[PDB]
Paper text:
The integrin receptor αMβ2 mediates phagocytosis of complement-opsonized objects, adhesion to the extracellular matrix, and transendothelial migration of leukocytes. Integrin αMβ2, also known as complement receptor 3, CD11b/CD18, and macrophage-1 antigen (Mac-1), participates in all three types of interactions. The ectodomain is divided into a HP consisting of the N-terminal domains, and the tailpiece consisting of the membrane-proximal C-terminal domains. αMβ2 contains a von Willebrand factor type A domain, known as the αI domain, in the α-chain. Nbs are single domain antibodies of typically 120 residues derived from the variable domain of heavy chain–only antibodies present in members of the Camelidae family.
We selected Nbs against recombinant human αI domain using a phage library generated from a Llama immunized with the αMβ2 HP. To favor the selection of Nbs with potential for interfering with the interaction between αI domain and C3d, we performed competitive elution with recombinant C3d. This elution strategy yielded the Nb hCD11bNb1, which we cloned into a bacterial expression vector, expressed, and purified. Data analysis with a 1:1 binding model revealed that the Nb binds with a low nanomolar affinity to both the αMβ2 HP and the αI domain. To support the modeling of the αMβ2–Nb complex, we also determined the structure of hCD11bNb1 itself based on diffraction data extending to a resolution of 1.14 Å. Furthermore, known structures of the αI domain and our own 1.14 Å-resolution structure of hCD11bNb1 itself considerably facilitated modeling of the intermolecular interface.
Residue numbers in the entry: 1 to 123
The structure:
Amino acid sequence: MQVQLVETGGGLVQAGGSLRLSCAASGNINSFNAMGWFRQAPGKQRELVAAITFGGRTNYADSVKGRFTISRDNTKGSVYLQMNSLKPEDTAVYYCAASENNLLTGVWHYWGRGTQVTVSSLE
């Protein structure tokens, strides 16, 4: 079976709150290395906001630095996105992606179907 990615954890969240997204990759862990989270806000391209090498080294989009943390557990074939200090501007469809290779910028060979995260303002 080809590797498959299913994101969990999406939903509605209040601004200032937090949310963890998770993705298990099915199949053979040896067939992928780098993993990442993309987000597509309405009207926008899918934007890579966090990526992680097989060994755990990370890179973040400037727009999420200091607020989001990407991590992984290879014993569970999983990658996680802990999103703190959420803002309305973080509302988007969040996609997990994976690569056969171990670079933080592509090529993204495998994609989940995405999960919606909606951050509502307090005012």
